C-alpha cells in the first residue's frame, strides 16, 4: 500500500537521524570503552553480573536493520551501555569514570535529538 510505503519512508528517515545521534554519542567515547561488547572470553562471569550486556556496536547492527522504532528504544539501549558499566565498574575506575562522561555529554546531544524527532514528526 501506499500507507506502508509512507511509515517505511518515516522509518528510513528515523533512522538516519539516529546513525547521526550514535555518531556524536560514540565520539563522546574516545577511548573506545564502549565500542565493542564486553568480551566473555576476558570477562568470563559478566552475564552473573548484567543480564542485558549493550554496547556501540550491537546498537549500530540493530539501527542498519532498522530496528529502532522510535528514539525512547534507542535512549533505552544508550542508557543500558551507562548502566551497566556503573554497576560493574567500581566508582573509582577508568571504566565508570568514561560512563560518567559519556552520559553527561550524551544529554545535551539526546536533549536536541527529542526536539528533532517531535519536530520532524
Request: glycine share 0%; proline share 17%; no cysteine.
Given at each position: 500500500s501506499m500507507e506502508q510505503v509512507a511509515m517505511e519512508l518515516r522509518l528510513t528517515e528515523l533512522t538516519r537521524l539516529l546513525r547521526s545521534v550514535l555518531d556524536q554519542l560514540q565520539d563522546k567515547d574516545p577511548a573506545r570503552i564502549?565500542?565493542?561488547?564486553?568480551?566473555l572470553k576476558e570477562v568470563p562471569d559478566y552475564l552473573d553480573h548484567i543480564k542485558h550486556p549493550m554496547d556501540f556496536a550491537t546498537m549500530r547492527k540493530r539501527l542498519e536493520a532498522q530496528g529502532y522504532k522510535n528514539l525512547h528504544e534507542f535512549e533505552e539501549d544508550f542508557d543500558l551501555i551507562i548502566d551497566n558499566c556503573m554497576k560493574y565498574n567500581a566508582r573509582d575506575t577508568v571504566f565508570y569514570r568514561a560512563a560518567v562522561r559519556l552520559r553527561d555529554q550524551g544529554g545535551v546531544v539526546l536533549r536536541q535529538a527529542r526536539r528533532e524527532v517531535d519536530s520532524i514528526g
Open positions: 564502549f565500542a565493542q561488547p564486553v568480551s
